[PDB]
């Protein structure tokens with residue numbers, strides 16, 4: 445992973461991309477009946493399985509301990525769903541493309557208490573992606589940065605292994621930074637523009653964290669064992685045999 | 687503000703720095719009695735007043751509308767308190783320097799339910815600042831970035847004025863990015879190191895957002911009118927006469 449060139453990093457990440465999933469509802473049946481939160485939860489459930497497979501294909505990620513892999517995914521999974529959603533929605537002003545068969549506006553979010561506020565923040569992020577003209581190659585870099593960065597400050601351990609793990613994570617993040625800069629330099633941007641755009645992109649990740657926190661508050665308020673993937677479920681999914 | 691050189695931006699920010707405040711408790715009296723949350727709340731109350739004055743001195747900030755100034759401070763105030771705390775604590779491993787007369791360890795945080803988790807995240811951030819050898823000039827740049835960036839995606843308005851306000855904010859943020867790079871180039875870092883360090887610094891701001899969200903959850907759970915500064919209080923403090 446640390447021996448990869450920028451071009452090789454980009455190719456690895458593009459190759460790792462998960463598929464765009466469809467919502468599971470009967471399109472011949474009335475929409476009034478189906479539960480929006482039910483549809484959204486089922487979609488998120490299925491997306492998480494593909495996210496596990498994607499994660500294992502991000503350079504450097506499988507170099508980490510299983511425990512640390514689980515910690516990183518536990519911290520990042522909702523941010524990763526959200527940046528994916530915002531990316532898919534970028535060319536659909538005023539709408540969130542949850543799936544190709546589930547394109548929702550802010551008014552449709554009003555059916556669930558607290559959801560319109562979340563819809564609005566996500567729509568504003570999609571708007572920002574449009575204003576910056578975010579590219580696919582940049583998007584995959586950002587998504588990988590979220591995976592590696594979101595949980596790296598909360599390991600709460602300074603065993604020798606943990607010190608080594610944190611060092612490796614920051615080395616991989618540095619490679620992704622190099623890659624973003626390389627993509628921008630290729631696009632013809634000046635050195636000033638390169639640094640400015642790097643900062644603009646990384647600063648949006650703070651807003652994505654914020655959205656995830658507001659989202660997790662909503663989910664935890666549901667007070668449900670079938671909501672939020674547990675440590676054990678994530679561990680089970682990541683702890684694969686050969 | 688947009689005509690400022692990097693050196694002039696740095697000088698303005700260093701000059702704008704608020705003072706380090708002391709905790710209000712009788713040092714001749716027993717510590718067992720005073721309320722940790724009481725002490726922390728009183729400190730935060732007084733720090734916020736100085737934060738208002740600091741904010742007005744960040745280049746570009748008073749160019750914005752009063753409403754937008756209030757929105758930005760409403761979004762950022764706890765992040766700003768937290769980055770200040772982490773900076774003050776950087777050279778005190780295992781401790782949080784709330785004030786020069788109030789240096790607390792994680793065990794002291796245990797007196798309040800939910801506080802040790804917050805103490806731990808803040809201590810880990812201070813640790814990271816140490817690992818990176820964060821400089822004072824870099825710190826003031828980051829704090830100003832938090833002020834301008836934290837609320838810029840949640841204006842939820844596309845009046846002509848709001849479009850102009852968001853454009854100006856991003857122009858000022860670009861200047862601060864230029865300034866950070868200039869500070870790093872001065873320090874002798876290579877172009878690769880410059881971009882890498884810029885990214886490392888901006889990525890910590892996502893963790894600071896996370897901490898603020900966990901903090902605001904704690905404060906809102908207190909269910910108290912004397913906790914969390916209202917829109918009106920912030921408006922009153924910012925809406926100064928001449």
Ligand SMILES: CC(C)CN1[C@H](c2ccc(/C=C/C(=O)O)cc2)c2ccc(O)cc2C[C@H]1C
Nearest residue numbers: 484485487488525526529659662670671672673
């Ligand atoms: C309140 C927010 C968290 C709602 N989010 C849903 C979403 C809905 C339910 C879950 C529940 C998952 C679970 O219970 O395991 C997760 C996300 C969702 C679903 C798929 C997706 O691409 C993105 C998002 C982001 C927001 C809308």
Ligand SMILES: CC(C)CN1[C@H](c2ccc(/C=C/C(=O)O)cc2)c2ccc(O)cc2C[C@H]1C
Nearest residue numbers: 726727729730767768771901904912913914915
């Ligand atoms: C649960 C966290 C939010 C606790 N934080 C306190 C803090 C305590 C009380 C308030 C309440 C303010 C209010 O009620 O207006 C704010 C921050 C604090 C105080 C001063 C300061 O430098 C930083 C911090 C950050 C964390 C420890």
